[PDB]
Amino acid sequence: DPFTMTNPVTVEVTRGLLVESRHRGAVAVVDGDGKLFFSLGDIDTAVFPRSACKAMQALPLVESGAADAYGFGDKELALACASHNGEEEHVALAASMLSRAGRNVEALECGAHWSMNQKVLIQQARSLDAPTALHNNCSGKHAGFICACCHRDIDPKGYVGYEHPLQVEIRAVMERLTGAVLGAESCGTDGCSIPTYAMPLRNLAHGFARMATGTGLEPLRAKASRRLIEACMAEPFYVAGSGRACTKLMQIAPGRIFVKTGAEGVFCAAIPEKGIGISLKSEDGATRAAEAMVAATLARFFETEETVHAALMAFAAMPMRNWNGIHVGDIRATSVFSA
Amino acid sequence: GIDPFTMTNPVTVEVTRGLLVESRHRGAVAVVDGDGKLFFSLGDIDTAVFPRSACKAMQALPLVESGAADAYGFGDKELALACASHNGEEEHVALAASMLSRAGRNVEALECGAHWSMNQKVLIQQARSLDAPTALHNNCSGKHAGFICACCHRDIDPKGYVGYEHPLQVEIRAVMERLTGAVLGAESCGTDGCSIPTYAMPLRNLAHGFARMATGTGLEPLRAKASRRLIEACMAEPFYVAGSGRACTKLMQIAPGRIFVKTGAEGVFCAAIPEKGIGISLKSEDGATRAAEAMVAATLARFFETEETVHAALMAFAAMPMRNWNGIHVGDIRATSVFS
Ligand SMILES: [Cl-]
Ligand SMILES: [Cl-]
Ligand SMILES: [Cl-]
Ligand SMILES: [Cl-]
Ligand SMILES: [Zn+2]
Ligand SMILES: [Zn+2]
């Protein structure tokens, strides 16, 4: 009988001299042609990408012509690809995207939530009675969905539904990019009420490598993919925002590194100039582990660019300080990433 | 005297989405009776684990044994707060402030630092009413008020009470060694979130320590009495141990007066069932609170299988639904069959 191997320990969290907690996980690094550069752990069992694949889901917004018809630039494209903090800049831009399609917050079907970022949440609490759908981290993606529908005269009502034309189109796009089979059996409902399709990490990484390089893509999809990847790297605040790893990681080497977090410990990334796509998951779903793992994986490709490498290693290995500012331990990606 | 077998910890908690397991947690559980006999276990219960806040009731023994709690007229709410990782609600803050003032001190005596509530609803209330939190809002402020009170009652200068060789920390090591039978020293010590020592020890020893506090077995009369007072106070005033929305408080409302529980940072739980002579400790390998919560409920449930209403209420913590922002059920967080 075959079985699945136990995932290796990818991240340790120390206190004093001891490992206090440990995370296991898996990483796939795939080039534009589909060759596996590097991997750790189980890259074949299907994993939910959650928000990490928002740039794939943003392809309808661009390919439909809607982004151009509505005058969207890199900030709107980045927001369409974002799990944003719900800061005022994000909420205003989502509202503007909807308004250009003749719609408003009432068209959003994602629901509302308070910021998961503590400083932004404090700001929101002090200025709002309750968040609205615009504050949802997925509001730019859903504004992008609504814009793709309205530009094409598709009724956006029910755009979250499995057989709404928008979800039909997103399945076709993601199957083409990743080569995975996306069906009801491997589908769940995402935090924002749209389908999320579990697929192998190997396929997810391959899909990001294709977006990053154009390999295997028809001309319009290759061009739209470049636009999205470049918009995210050009306006990284709009992908995440203040205090956030995705934003800071895309400020290390401006215009060269694409990253995107997903809920439950997922990260996707790409390095266009190296032809590389990356996907990963921390087995237990911890964000702190996925962040350390994506920085340590990226660092493998910048070892001779000392300033970039040092900045990535500062996310791969990070100090923890207590409320008095005393160093108590570290969160560190393990040696499997440098071997 | 060869070395024990190494172990990979089993999957104790699954998090599903749709038809699939989305995330998984591994961990370990020790259940020990008052005599030190191992009653049930899963995973590695012998490698040292930091208990973090889960052992606050052990650290509260100086407050009671010194005579300070009685000298200051404290009741169960103050004892519970001394044992608490509280939410920083107004009642917790006011009670820590009055424990300090009854000892002739104030917020400036606290050496733990300040933080915003880890509970989101309380955070929102704090943000709307405060420019910044103070040390009284720290989840450990009742414990640290207890420390300061223990010092002041005995005319021990509380300044520097976080330090490794302050008399209070010397006393805490002696208490915790007696209760747990573990060796506590600098090599197995770290600094806690509140700046005091935290000592790694095997889950087996931590569970035994809670079984001893719960039963009195192996303890001298004053320590057995003080331990009863602390465990009873937590069960009597469980809001003061944690607060609104919190697992420790809700778990202590299932079977009033019968189940003691306490969370610790990084996925630790300790528990006791005094009437059954049982102490419990556990850790999620990755540190996730959601896993530790499911594990403590599934472990407790094994002791109440013939008490259907208590069992059902515990099972609702062992397997909990997850809903998205629209209220749609997306999956569940469930303790696995290793608990059966
Ligand atoms: Cl969700
Ligand atoms: Cl294509
Ligand atoms: Cl800490
Ligand atoms: Cl004793
Ligand atoms: Zn979403
Ligand atoms: Zn503490």
TrEMBL record, chain B:
Keywords: Metal-binding, Zinc. The keyword Metal-binding applies. It comes from the Bacteria. Disulfide bonds join 140-194. Mg(2+) binds at residue 155. PANTHER family: L-ASPARAGINASE, PUTATIVE (AFU_ORTHOLOGUE AFUA_3G11890)-RELATED (PTHR42110:SF1). Zn(2+) 1 binds at residues 140, 143, 192, 194. The modification Cysteine sulfenic acid (-SOH) is found at residue 248. One of its GO terms (molecular function) is metal ion binding. It comes from Rhizobium etli (strain ATCC 51251 / DSM 11541 / JCM 21823 / NBRC 15573 / CFN 42). The lineage of its organism: Bacteria, Pseudomonadati, Pseudomonadota, Alphaproteobacteria, Hyphomicrobiales. This is L-asparaginase II protein. The keyword Zinc applies. Zn(2+) 2 binds at residues 140, 194.
